[PDB]
Each structure stands twice: as C-alpha cells, then as structure tokens.
Amino acid sequence: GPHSLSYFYTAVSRPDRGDSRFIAVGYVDDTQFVRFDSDAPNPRMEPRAPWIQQEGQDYWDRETRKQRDTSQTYRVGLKNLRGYYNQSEAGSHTYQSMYGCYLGPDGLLLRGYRQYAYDGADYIALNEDLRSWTAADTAAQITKRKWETANVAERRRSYLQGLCVESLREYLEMGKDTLQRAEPPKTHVTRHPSSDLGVTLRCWALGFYPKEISLTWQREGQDQSQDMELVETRPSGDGTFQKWAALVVPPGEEQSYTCHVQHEGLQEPLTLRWD
C-alpha cells in the first residue's frame, strides 16, 4: 500500500574495549535488504535480500563509504552524550537513529522522518514539516542549537524528498516479485484441553507478507478480544510472518466461535472455525 524505505542505526559503547560498535540495517517495508557492522573486518555494506545484489560495485562502494563515515560520527556522539549526562566511562550506553520515507499513493512522499534516542529514550526528532527540531531535554537542546546553526534540517528534507523516494521506487521495481506480492496467510484452527470448564481454540495464520494482519475471535458476531490471547506477530525465518489468537470456550460449544482474518493478501476477509 504505502511503501516505505527505512534505515535503523544502533551505536553502543563498550568500556571493556574502550571503543564502540555501530550497526545499521535497511528495510523496504518489512523486508531487510542491507546491513552494516563496524565490527566486521574491512567493514562493508552487505546484501541481505537477493534482489539488492543486482546493484553494481559503484553502489556497494559508495554505500560503504557513507557508513564508514557515519559510524565514525556516532562514535564521537557517544562520547559527547556521556559528557552531556555526566556519565562515566564505566558503563555501556546506546545511541540510536532511524529515518525513512513513506511513499504515498501517487508515488509522492507521504511522510518522511528522522529521530534519535539515547539509552532507549527519545532524544531529538525532525518535525513533520521537515524544517525544525523537537528536543526532549536540556542535553538535546544543545544538539538542536548545533544542528540549527549548521542547517541540518535542509539536508534531511532534501534526502527524504529526493534520494529516499527515488531509491525506494527503484528497490520496489527491482524486487517486485517479492516486495509487491502480498502473500496470504495459511490459516487453521486447533483445539486443546485446558482447565475446569475449559478448552482452548487457537486460530493460526502462517506464512503471510506483509506483516500487518488482523486476527480476532467472535461469538455470534460479538468480539471476544477481552478474554483471548494474541501473540505478537513473529518472523517465520523465510521472510514471511506468523501470528495466532487463542480463546478458552465451554466444552461442547466450539461451533459458536469463529476466527476472523484480515490481510491485504486476501480478496475478502476469512472466516474459519474448529473442524
């Protein structure tokens, strides 16, 4: 639907080694396609989906150069953050960034973002206008002033409106056989014993792509979400995803309950039940 290109950066201090480790990953929608790890010997941007391997050497060389530079900048940032917060070198800290573009229906930028966290807490963020920053505390206000002085916001807006969208369009065509195929869940309901006046029905959805799905239980069309167990959607290992929803029902009354599945890979919602 609204396709996206997103990158995720993690930098972590390692007191034991007196250095840090920078790891980046890139995704198109829910498919990881690149990684970088500064710990690798001769660290390079590396393919993680088969369709990105049709990029030539200019692409791998230039992406690698960007990450080596960025990885350096984040090592310095870790030191700076340590100072802002009056922290010693004894403990590990984490500096994260994420940015990306959401492609509208018209192939236009729907929403571009860029934000940062420190030790798991929101630190600073580019506002929706792509023109100004919101800083989370006193330390982040120093950063905000630095980045206003150097007009960083114009650099981010340029990227998110220009190369982010342009490259996403290329990836989507390059990998169209997978990134643009909606793979529908394989669904079924299982039955299991339980407790006093208790039998569990589990509605499975296996092998679907993309990750967004709706699984719910109903009795006579009345939603049972209050008493059901819904696990977080989880990766299959093969690029697809898995999820299930389970409910305890009275013994003998299995046929009163129906599991309802919505997924963009199905022409119409599914209704299924214990059989």
Partner: peptide, 9 residues
Amino acid sequence: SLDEYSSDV
C-alpha cells in the same frame, strides 16, 4: 540508499 550526511550530537 543511505542518507550520507552525518552531524555530531
């Protein structure tokens, strides 16, 4: 494609 610009925190 990555955003090439880096800015110190």
